[PDB]
């Protein structure tokens, strides 16, 4: 019988992606529970073709395994009586917009299926370490003041993260406890500033309103040039301190 937490997540992903039964995974060699430094055992990578009505562009969808209790035997996560969460109670997801270069390949260019970028696996491992080392889990609406380009590029204006509920995956119960899917969203400095000083959910709601800022499913585009407040200056009206 398979590891019960891992199996629940795989089963959930099978329902959501019935036509991708065997995705690529980034797999760790020395597992964290054997003394490795990378807390995620696996990161699945899926292609999502998009959805016109919901303003979802084609993108790569990443899902981590290891922040929740994959195994049930305390090899990583101690089980406390009366705790309902599986491990830290969540896994990380990330939605990454295909670049213009990538988009010109898969429709005309020929032989073999295009490989997803693997750099987001480092990003999720690093966020995973941050959560293990501080002991704080992530909640919807949270921000992470990462302060560096998510892809390690010198050019991307996306240096920080907000946390949203994954629109496809949502939250599930498993044999080892509940697992929320916490979708990481790359944001501009001003977006981070306002999520921090005002509110994260309200900033995510702004981002969802247009395709240019992520559409309904909050896809991160590393080449995004303008923040939501630059594109739609009306959103600034919600940010004023009220006196009183």
């Amino acid at each position: 019988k398979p590891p019960p937490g891992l199996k629940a997540i795989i089963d959930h992903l099978g329902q959501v992606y019935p036509n991708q039964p065997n995705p690529l995974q980034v797999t760790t060699l020395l597992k964290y529970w054997l003394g490795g430094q990378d807390p995620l055992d696996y990161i699945s990578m899926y292609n999502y073709p998009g959805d016109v009505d919901r303003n979802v562009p084609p993108h790569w969808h990443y899902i981590s395994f290891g922040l929740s209790d994959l195994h049930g035997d305390e090899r990583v996560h101690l089980r406390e009586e009366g705790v309902t969460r599986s491990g830290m109670g969540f896994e990380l997801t990330f939605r990454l917009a295909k670049t213009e270069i990538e988009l010109k390949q898969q429709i005309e260019n020929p032989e073999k299926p295009q490989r997803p970028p693997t750099w987001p696996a480092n990003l999720l491992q690093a966020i995973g370490r941050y959560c293990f080392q501080t002991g704080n889990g992530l909640c919807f609406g949270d921000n992470i003041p990462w302060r560096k380009s998510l892809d390690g590029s010198t050019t991307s204006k996306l240096q920080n993260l907000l946390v949203a509920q994954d629109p496809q995956l949502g939250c599930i119960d498993t044999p080892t406890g509940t697992v929320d899917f916490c979708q990481i969203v790359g944001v501009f400095d001003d977006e981070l500033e306002q999520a921090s000083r005002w509110n994260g959910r309200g900033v995510l709601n702004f981002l969802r309103q247009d395709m240019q800022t992520g559409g309904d499913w909050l896809v991160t585009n590393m080449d995004r040039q303008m923040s939501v407040f630059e594109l739609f200056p009306e959103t600034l009206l919600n940010l004023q301190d009220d006196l009183e």
């Binding site: 398979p2 891992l6 795989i10 065997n22 995705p23 690529l24 995974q25 980034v26 797999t27 760790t28 060699l29 020395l30 490795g36 430094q37 990378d38 696996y42 699945s44 693997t118 750099w119 696996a121 480092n122 491992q125």
Partner: peptide, 28 residues
């Protein structure tokens, strides 16, 4: 003379503790 076919070797995006495989390589 100094040539090098020698070629070792970090596996996924700079992380030597990671490899790229298919899900079914990891499970039934």
């Amino acid at each position: 003379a100094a040539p090098v076919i020698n070629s070792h070797t970090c596996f996924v995006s700079g992380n030597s503790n990671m490899i790229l495989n298919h899900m079914n390589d990891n499970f039934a």
